[PDB]
């Protein structure tokens, strides 16, 4: 039987963890300056309390726990939550919210499509093709001024029909760190409602882009506009639980009857895929969320992270600047979130790692928070050398 | 769009609480419960595991992304709990999963990927969640006779004549032991016989090990599996940390993929990840931990195995008062089989009609299908529930 399986391609993004003077630039977690990816210390005061209010290990909620999903709604959606009209369903990370949001979708829909930017997070796509969903692309990456072909993405957009879905990323775009402004997000909108294409918003970075509140922001705006939306959100990043597998599925509908429905087939998608949902990670978020003493310092301690990332891009930009007295860079000071694409090509790109030891991703993604005072020039001139 | 969503049903085991929740009677007692309780009515947090909670909070350092197919300690310890000293590395993989549940779902996704046609044998009955998750992949369902309802014993001779019809290629799940809801289990040399078929029939069997160390002990309890693992090529075993652990909400179970050779066990772990990446990328970190810390280090796992022996005992001891309970009361041995059943579970063979009876006139309640928890019972509740039995006529 077994011997019968076929081969089956690795993730290329997780292999660099293999591939690792070397300057590690691959991976998608927050290092800090002597790159370790601490826990958060709103985390670990968490975890404390938790050893010592927790009097037992029984089955708790199928769709999560109420605490995590009230606090994960407010945290996304702020006063803009109309639980009456709002279903919540605790997942295994943000990449099981994805999986789930799929599977519902295509329940409703056994028709649908699933328009995903150019380029996008390859493990979208990987998903969307174990799963048989046809997916088609809207432009997205300018790859001339490194920002977002507007244009494009509108015209590409308007083609999509009633029942399809479109993948958004809610803010902090990977790979291209390249985002758009509200104003955008605004006609967006407008395109959607006229399409009738179902919004699904993967927000994995609330908080690294421009303020928690901020990156939420868009989010926030389709949700005003379109009656029915799906969000999938990850705690692993703005938390630091990557290893803790938490995240959610928000399904807004439009009305309290779909909602008991959409509650309903949530529930059931979590049963017969593995029961219930991890607990351990979606306590501390909620235990965090909801005391103010440990939120106020997450809060502090993530806009810490975010200022000094923002610090980083500008001193990276400087330093090219200064090597080529040219604004051809400038875009990394623009760019927002961890993710920004050099642009350089795949030759390119596989010299720097095999000779200067820095490993990035093949299309040039590079994680800004692996950089520091120290490897900075370093990158600098290893670009330099060869093209860009 | 998603009004065109179908109403999925409800899990019902809230309804079940529902009822109950609402009986006005102040001596009610509730014997439908799935997880274990100690004599206070407490599903307690085992003391190894919150002796490897303190240690984890100290030495952790970071929460990066770790292992996709789990963590080596654990995939290790986890193999060596189940197989013994019959591991044999070269040619197992292994899958870090969300729970029990999730190592089934996995082993039903990876099965039909090496056989688009196949075909699942389940007992007659079993634990409901198996047929829905079949039902849901859309999977072939077949069942073979198992629980005799008027022995309350397992129906071999059908088992046997049922199973040899399996073909090369299908799947044949068995509890590995204290089979849920019945409680009634197969022996050593049926489980010798049964290898016999499965050889015969070339069908790959799926072993459901939810319950280990609430039987006879924790090798007594593997040893139906390590027949298999050792007579059979490949073998399929999906294990739970949920209960003999007592980390019910951490979700933490995996998958055993036990191969001919190690170019097909490469193949199989490689499938494994991939399954595990398109799913939900990387499983739950937590309870694994927990799991490696108490089995790895001396002192945890000795006072694990410990207070898992004394949970053991004392629903033995449970089993046997209630049978002797029902013996006295019926002046005859025709209830015995309560202490022969292994397990927190034991289907006792009331019609719907009697279960409904016991419950309108004694508020004692249960399961639909007769299926009670042992672990639900004492000193108190025993006299109750076996006078019950008798007076509904049972
Ligand atoms: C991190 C991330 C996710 C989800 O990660 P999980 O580890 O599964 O929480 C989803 N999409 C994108 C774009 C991400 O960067
Ligand atoms: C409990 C149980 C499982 C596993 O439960 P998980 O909670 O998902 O670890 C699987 N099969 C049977 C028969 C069980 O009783
Ligand atoms: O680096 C990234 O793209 C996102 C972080 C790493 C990954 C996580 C999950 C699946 C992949």
Redesign the pocket.
């Known amino acids: 039987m077994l011997g019968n399986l076929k081969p089956q391609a690795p993730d290329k993004i997780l292999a660099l963890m293999g591939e690792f003077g070397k300057i590690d630039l691959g991976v998608g977690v927050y290092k800090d300056a002597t790159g370790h990816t601490p826990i958060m210390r709103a985390v670990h005061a968490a975890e404390q309390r938790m050893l010592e209010t927790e009097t037992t290990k029984t089955?708790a909620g199928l769709s999560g726990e109420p605490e995590f999903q009230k606090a994960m709604g407010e945290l996304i959606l702020g006063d803009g939550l109309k639980s009456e009209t709002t279903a919540t369903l605790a997942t295994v990370g943000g990449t099981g919210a994805l999986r789930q949001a799929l599977e519902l979708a295509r329940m409703a829909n056994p028709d649908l499509r699933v328009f995903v930017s150019d380029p996008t997070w390859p493990n979208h796509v990987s998903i969307m093709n174990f799963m048989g969903l046809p997916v088609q692309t809207y432009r997205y990456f300018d790859a001339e001024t490194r920002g977002v072909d507007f244009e494009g993405m509108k015209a590409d957009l308007a083609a999509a029909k009633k029942g399809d879905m479109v993948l958004l990323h809610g803010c902090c775009h990977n790979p291209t760190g390249a985002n758009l402004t509200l104003d955008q997000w605004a006609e967006i909108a407008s395109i959607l409602e006229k399409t009738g294409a179902l919004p699904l918003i993967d927000l994995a970075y609330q908080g690294f882009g421009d303020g928690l509140e901020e990156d939420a922001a868009g989010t926030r705006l389709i949700a005003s506009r379109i009656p029915e939306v799906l969000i999938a959100a990850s705690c692993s990043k703005n938390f630091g639980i990557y290893r803790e597998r938490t995240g959610c599925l928000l399904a807004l509908c439009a009305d309290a009857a779909t909602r008991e429905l959409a509650q309903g087939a949530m529930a059931f998608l979590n049963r017969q895929t593995?029961?219930?949902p991890p607990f351990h990670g979606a306590k501390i978020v909620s235990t965090v969320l909801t005391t103010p003493e440990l939120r106020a310092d997450w809060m502090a301690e993530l806009e810490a992270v975010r200022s000094g990332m923002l610090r980083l891009r500008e001193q990276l930009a400087g330093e090219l600047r200064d090597l080529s007295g040219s604004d051809r860079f400038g875009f990394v000071a623009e760019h927002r979130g961890m993710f920004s694409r050099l642009g350089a090509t795949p030759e390119q790109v596989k010299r720097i790692k095999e000779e200067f030891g820095i490993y990035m991703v093949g299309d040039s993604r590079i994680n800004i928070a692996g950089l520091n005072d120290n490897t900075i020039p370093i990158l600098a001139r290893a670009i330099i050398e060869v093209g860009v």
């Open positions: 089955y593995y029961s219930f």
